[PDB]
Amino acid sequence: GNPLVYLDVDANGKPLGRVVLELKADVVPKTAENFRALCTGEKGFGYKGSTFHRVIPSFMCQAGDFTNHNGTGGKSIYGSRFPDENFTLKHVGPGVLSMANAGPNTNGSQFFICTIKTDWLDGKHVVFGHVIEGMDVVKKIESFGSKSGRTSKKIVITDCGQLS
Ligand SMILES: CCOC(=O)CNC(=O)NCc1cccc(-c2ccncc2N)c1
Ligand SMILES: [K+]
């Protein structure tokens, strides 16, 4: 079935705990597979050692720019970008896992975890999973954000991978 993956996150080198995510390979197989492989690092690149670079309280926590660490970089396992797979899954509340983008058909590696319902993003960002465990960890990350998106501590995915 659907991959279960994890992200172990610290703040200025101090551990905050584990976020566990289900990836909806049953609905968005290509988008799910991208994220799964970037978690395991099996392609020779991925999320381990990269940051949450944009975190906005009462909105979302954004990560996945593992090349430039600021929203301008990242890439997929397929190439620099890939199409919007479908918009079947909606931004229904906190804990939704969704692709960041720069417009239609610009998915790379950047993603976000929602800390509120973000339904104004429906049909524009490809939702591909949700938090199974560690919404308290997400809330810790959210606490180091700001209204600008800048983080007040360096928030690092110290490890990541696939549980099943
Ligand atoms: C709530 C989520 O909000 C957003 O998605 C706001 N947008 C955003 O953060 N865009 C940066 C970005 C996001 C994703 C991919 C790129 C990209 C960069 C350079 N070359 C190719 C690319 N595919 C850039
Ligand atoms: K706002």
Curated annotation (Swiss-Prot):
GO terms for cellular component: cytoplasm; membrane; mitochondrial matrix; mitochondrial permeability transition pore complex; mitochondrion. Residues 6-162 form the PPIase cyclophilin-type domain. It comes from the Eukaryota. The modification N6-succinyllysine is found at K24, K43, I132, K147. Signal peptide: none annotated. It catalyses: [protein]-peptidylproline (omega=180) = [protein]-peptidylproline (omega=0). Its main location: mitochondrion. Keywords: Acetylation, Apoptosis, Isomerase, Mitochondrion, Necrosis, Rotamase, S-nitrosylation, Transit peptide. Changing C160S: Blocks Ca(2+)-induced mPTP opening and reduces hydrogen peroxide-induced cell death. The modification N6-acetyllysine is found at K24, K124. The modification S-nitrosocysteine is found at C160. GO terms for molecular function: cyclosporin A binding; peptidyl-prolyl cis-trans isomerase activity. It is an enzyme of class 5 (isomerase). It is found in: Mitochondrion matrix. Its EC number is 5.2.1.8. GO terms for biological process: apoptotic mitochondrial changes; cellular response to arsenic-containing substance; cellular response to calcium ion; cellular response to hydrogen peroxide; mitochondrial depolarization; mitochondrial outer membrane permeabilization involved in programmed cell death; necroptotic process; negative regulation of apoptotic process. Inhibited by cyclosporin A (CsA). Is displaced by CsA from the mPTP leading to a lower open probability of the mPTP. Transmembrane segments: none annotated. Acetylated at Lys-124; deacetylated at Lys-124 by SIRT3. Associates with the mitochondrial membrane ATP synthase F(1)F(0) ATP synthase; the association is increased by inorganic phosphate (Pi) and decreased by cyclosporin A (CsA). Interacts with ATP5F1B; ATP5PD and ATP5PO. Interacts with SLC25A3; the interaction is impaired by CsA. Interacts with BCL2; the interaction is impaired by CsA. Interacts with TP53; the association implicates preferentially tetrameric TP53, is induced by oxidative stress and is impaired by CsA. Interacts with C1QBP. Interacts with MCUR1. Belongs to the cyclophilin-type PPIase family. PPIase that catalyzes the cis-trans isomerization of proline imidic peptide bonds in oligopeptides and may therefore assist protein folding. Involved in regulation of the mitochondrial permeability transition pore (mPTP). It is proposed that its association with the mPTP is masking a binding site for inhibiting inorganic phosphate (Pi) and promotes the open probability of the mPTP leading to apoptosis or necrosis; the requirement of the PPIase activity for this function is debated. In cooperation with mitochondrial p53/TP53 is involved in activating oxidative stress-induced necrosis. This is Peptidyl-prolyl cis-trans isomerase F, mitochondrial. It comes from Homo sapiens.
